[PDB]
Structure formats: structure tokens, C-alpha cells
Amino acid sequence: TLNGGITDMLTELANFEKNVSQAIHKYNAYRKAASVIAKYPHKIKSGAEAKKLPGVGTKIAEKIDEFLATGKLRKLEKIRQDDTSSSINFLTRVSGIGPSAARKFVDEGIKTLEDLRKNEDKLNHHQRIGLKYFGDFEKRIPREEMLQMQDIVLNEVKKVDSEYIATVCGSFRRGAESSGDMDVLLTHPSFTSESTKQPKLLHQVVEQLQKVHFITDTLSKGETKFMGVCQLPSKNDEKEYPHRRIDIRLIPKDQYYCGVLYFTGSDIFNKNMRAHALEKGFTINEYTIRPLGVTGVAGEPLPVDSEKDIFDYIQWKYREPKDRSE
DNA sequence: GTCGG
DNA sequence: GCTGATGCGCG
DNA sequence: CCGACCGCGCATCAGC
Ligand SMILES: [Mn+2]
Ligand SMILES: [Mn+2]
Ligand SMILES: [Mn+2]
Ligand SMILES: [Mn+2]
Ligand SMILES: [Mn+2]
Ligand SMILES: [Mn+2]
Ligand SMILES: [Mn+2]
Ligand SMILES: [Mn+2]
Ligand code: NA
Ligand code: NA
């Protein structure tokens, strides 16, 4: 946290451009500036010193100069006290409310958690669940709870079938002492790249996890990705655990290493790696790494036996999950 | 907003 | 009733 | 200067 003042303001500026300005590339530009400054090993003494980093241009060095001069930023003061901007920003904290719905609510005068209760009937299933667990979803998960969460899913999973393999990923796999949610990568030998039919795989795992009252709600469900809510079992009914976001992702077994690389993250690392893959003639997704043709068409998937195999393809020295929190 | 082309 | 553009989301 | 800026899964609903 050597430059947290600067990275905090860049993050709040990125969030402003996503939620209010609906400018995803200005959101991404600020996050990239913030991620690069988080990585810089000297305390930033001026915007000129920051402009030397890839991702920090004139306008950000200007905001850093103002921020170090005054301890504040005028642009952010305006945004915090703008009724629309701050109300839109607030609503996007509800899961299911993104920048479009937020702006439309505020245009209808719906602009506080109470207002969303009065108009519960204007929310889709996802939003209504995000309002229901609004506070719980902002609570972090101690790694101690994560470990009990991991033990419950792994046990239930192969109480459905021996051959399942469940890998908890996301920030937990990177050794985070606390996590935003639970991200679970799922595989099975009967579902590979050339597999057919099936897809009753995610459902039986989800259904089993519901049958033991671990999953409590569903945000979305498909044959490869599940998004929902879970909860650690209440200790003899004594101040229940917060409800938690869980994501389960079912990847073909022969594609496990691309899948685990993607789901381990972090998101900015994934974006940095895939960009770097692009320069060296590759395209990385959660299934394959494919070579880039002369034109722009992607080639056939390359053989992958390890997370490191992908790093070498793109001439990146392997970085362990702990070192992936970009 | 940024920076490579 | 249908669907594909749009929205929201995952790392 | 100018435009590209990772990659993809699922749900909703305007316009038929
Ligand atoms: Mn009100
Ligand atoms: Mn997560
Ligand atoms: Mn997640
Ligand atoms: Mn029951
Ligand atoms: Mn995330
Ligand atoms: Mn590079
Ligand atoms: Mn459709
Ligand atoms: Mn421009
Ligand atoms: Na720079
Ligand atoms: Na949201």
C-alpha cells in the first residue's frame, strides 16, 4: 500500500466511467494505470514520475499532481456530490444492477435501497436476490470459512460421482487471506472437448449442493456455468453465517489447464496475459490457446498439459497463483 | 485515457 | 410466442 | 494524431 492514495482515486475514477459514463475503455484504462502503479516499488512523488509507467498518460499524471498537491481531487468531489452520479454509483453495488439499469432507476426516482424495496416488482430475479443479500455480498470471506466451504463442496461433489474434480479458484487459489466469493472449477472425464450430449453434470452437482442446503439461491444456470448463493451450515442456530456468492464452472477435462488459469485470475492478470498472448501470435480463452494466423483467423488449439505450458507458449516466465493478483 | 503505429 | 440485441456478469 | 482496447456464459425484453 505504498501508493494507495493514488490507486484508490484511480479505482474510484474507473468505477465512475464504468457505472455512470458507460465508458468501459476508460474504466479499463484507469484500472490498468492503477494496477501498474500498485506494482511500482517507489513512493510516487509527482505525476512526472508516474507518467514514466506504461498506462499512465498526461491526464492521469495531471490528476496525480493535483492529488499530491491538495490531498483531494476536484473531479471526484464533483462526482461524489452529484445527485445522479452518486445514486447511479450506489445502485450498481446491487448484484444484477449494472450501469444501464442503475441509470434507468435513477431516472425514475428509484435511488436508495429503500426505494428498491418499494419497487421490488420492477427487479428481475437476479436483482431481487442482490437486494435480498445486499450487505452479506459486501462482506469478505475469511480464508477459514473458505476452507470449510471448500471441504463441503468437494465432499458433496464426489458424493455424486467419484470421477468429479472440483478446484476452488479465484482469489482463494492465489492465497488471499480473504475472498470476495467462491469460484469452483468443475470437471469430469465424460465431458471433454469432443464429448457429446451430457450437460446433466453441473445440474447434479448443483442439485446435490441444494439438497444439503448449502446452495440457497440461483442467479443464473446453464450447462457449463452456475451463479448463485451459498451459506455455511449454522452452528446449532447461533448467529448464522453471511450468505455468499458462489460460481461453479464446468470445463471439459482435456481443457482443465486453460480453465483453471482463467478462473484463478486475477481479472487484470487475465487481461494482461491475453493481450500479451495476442502480441506473440496467440489467443487465450478459458478453453484453448490458439495460434494467430497471418490474417486474423485463429488456428487449432495447441496441446496443453499444465498452467506453465501456456506461459511458455507466449514466452512468459511461469508465475505462481500467489503472484497473479495483478 | 492511453500508446503504439 | 420467439429471438437476438443488449445487459450483467466471471476471472 | 488515431483508433483498438481479453474473451466468454446466461437472462431479459423490445420489437415483432
Ligand atoms: Mn426514497
Ligand atoms: Mn471470486
Ligand atoms: Mn466469482
Ligand atoms: Mn429442503
Ligand atoms: Mn471480480
Ligand atoms: Mn508485453
Ligand atoms: Mn436467445
Ligand atoms: Mn481519440
Ligand atoms: Na506512461
Ligand atoms: Na452490480
Side-chain angles (χ1 to χ4, degrees), chain A residues 1-238 240-326:
Chain A
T1 166
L2 248 201
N3 287 295
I6 294 157
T7 65
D8 276 344
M9 86 156 171
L10 295 184
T11 285
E12 194 190 345
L13 279 156
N15 284 322
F16 163 76
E17 308 282 2
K18 173 178 172 188
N19 298 324
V20 186
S21 295
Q22 303 198 25
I24 196 77
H25 299 301
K26 272 160 109 130
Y27 159 76
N28 277 343
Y30 277 125
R31 292 224 299 153
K32 177 199 175 186
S35 153
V36 154
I37 285 176
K39 208 177 298 135
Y40 184 67
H42 312 307
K43 192 130 178 155
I44 296 185
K45 281 246 226 163
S46 85
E49 171 175 9
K51 178 144 162 133
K52 305 201 220 214
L53 312 179
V56 173
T58 317
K59 304 284 278 300
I60 286 177
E62 223 201 318
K63 300 198 178 74
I64 279 150
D65 269 329
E66 156 163 0
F67 179 77
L68 300 179
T70 59
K72 50 139 183 213
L73 188 72
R74 265 163 300 121
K75 193 171 181 51
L76 284 190
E77 232 71 74
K78 174 253 161 217
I79 284 148
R80 290 157 144 146
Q81 307 149 171
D82 175 67
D83 223 316
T84 300
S85 292
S86 68
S87 280
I88 286 185
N89 259 319
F90 172 71
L91 296 201
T92 74
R93 283 165 61 192
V94 182
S95 194
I97 303 192
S100 197
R103 173 167 298 272
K104 181 167 217 93
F105 286 137
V106 86
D107 273 19
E108 303 181 55
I110 304 178
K111 55 172 71 188
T112 56
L113 284 178
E114 198 173 88
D115 292 339
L116 297 158
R117 270 149 189 158
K118 332 264 270 62
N119 311 277
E120 214 164 306
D121 266 44
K122 291 193 180 68
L123 313 195
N124 58 47
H125 175 74
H126 188 144
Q127 289 156 340
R128 225 176 299 208
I129 300 276
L131 176 62
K132 162 160 178 205
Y133 306 114
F134 179 85
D136 277 354
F137 287 2
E138 295 201 324
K139 292 176 171 203
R140 283 224 145 221
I141 309 181
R143 193 182 180 82
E144 160 186 26
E145 301 195 356
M146 283 297 261
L147 288 168
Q148 333 173 30
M149 288 166 84
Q150 163 176 249
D151 292 352
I152 292 183
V153 177
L154 269 53
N155 191 47
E156 301 301 335
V157 152
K158 301 180 15 160
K159 286 175 48 193
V160 185
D161 194 50
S162 146
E163 301 176 302
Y164 275 118
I165 296 201
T167 301
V168 178
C169 306
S171 82
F172 169 84
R173 179 145 194 272
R174 313 193 305 263
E177 289 291 314
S178 75
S179 290
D181 68 348
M182 211 196 190
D183 303 300
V184 180
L185 169 75
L186 202 56
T187 187
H188 197 287
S190 62
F191 178 43
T192 78
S193 38
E194 306 232 300
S195 279
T196 192
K197 252 198 35 163
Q198 314 335 109
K200 291 108 37 94
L201 266 48
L202 186 46
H203 175 66
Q204 284 161 357
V205 167
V206 167
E207 245 187 6
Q208 169 65 24
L209 283 167
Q210 284 164 330
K211 165 151 261 279
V212 306
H213 305 93
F214 178 72
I215 286 181
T216 79
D217 305 80
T218 294
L219 308 189
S220 53
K221 200 172 177 297
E223 41 152 53
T224 166
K225 177 180 64 123
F226 171 84
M227 294 183 18
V229 192
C230 64
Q231 189 180 32
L232 270 184
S234 212
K235 252 171 198 161
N236 332 315
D237 253 14
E238 298 177 342
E240 41 166 318
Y241 284 95
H243 299 70
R244 313 288 204 190
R245 280 272 296 106
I246 181 166
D247 297 316
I248 311 179
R249 196 53 210 275
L250 177 67
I251 297 277
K253 189 145 170 131
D254 64 67
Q255 279 170 357
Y256 168 91
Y257 296 106
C258 299
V260 83
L261 180 71
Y262 139 84
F263 223 10
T264 285
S266 75
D267 52 10
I268 281 136
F269 164 88
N270 286 359
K271 218 270 154 173
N272 290 157
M273 186 169 183
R274 285 158 186 222
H276 209 73
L278 279 178
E279 319 162 3
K280 305 240 166 130
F282 296 105
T283 174
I284 294 181
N285 66 23
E286 71 261 51
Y287 309 107
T288 67
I289 173 162
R290 298 171 181 262
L292 262 206
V294 195
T295 165
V297 174
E300 300 304 274
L302 295 172
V304 168
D305 325 290
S306 68
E307 253 168 316
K308 190 200 168 35
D309 271 355
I310 303 148
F311 284 78
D312 309 331
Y313 271 128
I314 62 167
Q315 320 178 9
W316 257 19
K317 281 332 112 179
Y318 181 76
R319 321 203 336 232
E320 295 249 307
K322 170 269 163 143
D323 303 298
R324 300 230 202 120
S325 313
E326 219 142 80

Short mmCIF file of all heavy atoms in Angstrom, two decimals, chain A residues 91-98, chain C residues 8-9, ligand 10:
data_model
loop_
_atom_site.label_atom_id
_atom_site.label_comp_id
_atom_site.label_asym_id
_atom_site.label_seq_id
_atom_site.Cartn_x
_atom_site.Cartn_y
_atom_site.Cartn_z
N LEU A 91 -26.42 2.31 -6.78
CA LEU A 91 -27.24 1.20 -7.26
C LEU A 91 -26.41 0.08 -7.88
O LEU A 91 -26.77 -1.09 -7.73
CB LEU A 91 -28.29 1.73 -8.23
CG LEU A 91 -29.30 2.68 -7.56
CD1 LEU A 91 -30.57 2.80 -8.34
CD2 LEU A 91 -29.64 2.21 -6.16
N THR A 92 -25.29 0.40 -8.55
CA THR A 92 -24.51 -0.67 -9.17
C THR A 92 -23.88 -1.60 -8.14
O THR A 92 -23.33 -2.63 -8.52
CB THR A 92 -23.42 -0.13 -10.10
OG1 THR A 92 -22.35 0.43 -9.34
CG2 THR A 92 -24.00 0.93 -11.02
N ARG A 93 -23.93 -1.26 -6.85
CA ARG A 93 -23.43 -2.16 -5.84
C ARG A 93 -24.36 -3.35 -5.64
O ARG A 93 -23.92 -4.38 -5.12
CB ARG A 93 -23.21 -1.40 -4.54
CG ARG A 93 -21.95 -0.56 -4.57
CD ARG A 93 -21.94 0.46 -3.45
NE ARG A 93 -21.97 -0.17 -2.14
CZ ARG A 93 -22.20 0.48 -1.01
NH1 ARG A 93 -22.38 1.79 -1.00
NH2 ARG A 93 -22.24 -0.20 0.14
N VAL A 94 -25.62 -3.25 -6.06
CA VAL A 94 -26.52 -4.40 -6.08
C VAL A 94 -26.17 -5.32 -7.24
O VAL A 94 -26.09 -4.88 -8.39
CB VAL A 94 -27.99 -3.94 -6.16
CG1 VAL A 94 -28.93 -5.14 -6.12
CG2 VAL A 94 -28.33 -2.98 -5.02
N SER A 95 -25.98 -6.60 -6.95
CA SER A 95 -25.74 -7.58 -8.00
C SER A 95 -26.96 -7.67 -8.91
O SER A 95 -28.09 -7.78 -8.43
CB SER A 95 -25.44 -8.94 -7.38
OG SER A 95 -24.91 -9.80 -8.35
N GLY A 96 -26.74 -7.64 -10.22
CA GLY A 96 -27.80 -7.59 -11.20
C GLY A 96 -28.11 -6.20 -11.70
O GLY A 96 -28.72 -6.05 -12.78
N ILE A 97 -27.73 -5.17 -10.95
CA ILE A 97 -27.87 -3.79 -11.40
C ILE A 97 -26.51 -3.36 -11.95
O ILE A 97 -25.53 -3.23 -11.21
CB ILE A 97 -28.35 -2.85 -10.28
CG1 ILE A 97 -29.67 -3.34 -9.70
CG2 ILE A 97 -28.59 -1.44 -10.83
CD1 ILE A 97 -30.32 -2.33 -8.82
N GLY A 98 -26.46 -3.17 -13.27
CA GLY A 98 -25.31 -2.60 -13.92
C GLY A 98 -25.61 -1.18 -14.30
O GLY A 98 -26.61 -0.58 -13.86
P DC C 8 -27.03 -3.28 -16.96
OP1 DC C 8 -27.82 -2.61 -15.90
OP2 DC C 8 -25.90 -2.51 -17.54
"O5'" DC C 8 -26.39 -4.62 -16.37
"C5'" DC C 8 -27.22 -5.66 -15.99
"C4'" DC C 8 -26.39 -6.81 -15.49
"O4'" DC C 8 -26.00 -7.59 -16.63
"C3'" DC C 8 -25.09 -6.39 -14.78
"O3'" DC C 8 -25.09 -6.88 -13.45
"C2'" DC C 8 -23.97 -6.98 -15.64
"C1'" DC C 8 -24.69 -8.06 -16.44
N1 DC C 8 -24.05 -8.35 -17.79
C2 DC C 8 -23.80 -9.69 -18.19
O2 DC C 8 -24.16 -10.62 -17.45
N3 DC C 8 -23.19 -9.91 -19.39
C4 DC C 8 -22.82 -8.89 -20.16
N4 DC C 8 -22.23 -9.16 -21.34
C5 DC C 8 -23.05 -7.53 -19.76
C6 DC C 8 -23.65 -7.31 -18.58
P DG C 9 -23.80 -6.71 -12.51
OP1 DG C 9 -24.26 -6.76 -11.11
OP2 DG C 9 -23.02 -5.56 -12.99
"O5'" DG C 9 -22.97 -8.05 -12.74
"C5'" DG C 9 -23.61 -9.30 -12.63
"C4'" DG C 9 -22.76 -10.40 -13.23
"O4'" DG C 9 -22.68 -10.24 -14.66
"C3'" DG C 9 -21.32 -10.38 -12.78
"O3'" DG C 9 -21.20 -11.08 -11.60
"C2'" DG C 9 -20.61 -11.10 -13.92
"C1'" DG C 9 -21.56 -10.95 -15.11
N9 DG C 9 -20.95 -10.24 -16.22
C8 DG C 9 -20.94 -8.89 -16.44
N7 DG C 9 -20.31 -8.55 -17.52
C5 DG C 9 -19.84 -9.75 -18.04
C6 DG C 9 -19.06 -10.02 -19.20
O6 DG C 9 -18.61 -9.21 -20.03
N1 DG C 9 -18.81 -11.39 -19.35
C2 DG C 9 -19.25 -12.38 -18.48
N2 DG C 9 -18.91 -13.65 -18.77
N3 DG C 9 -19.97 -12.13 -17.39
C4 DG C 9 -20.21 -10.81 -17.23
NA NA E 10 -23.78 -4.66 -9.86
#
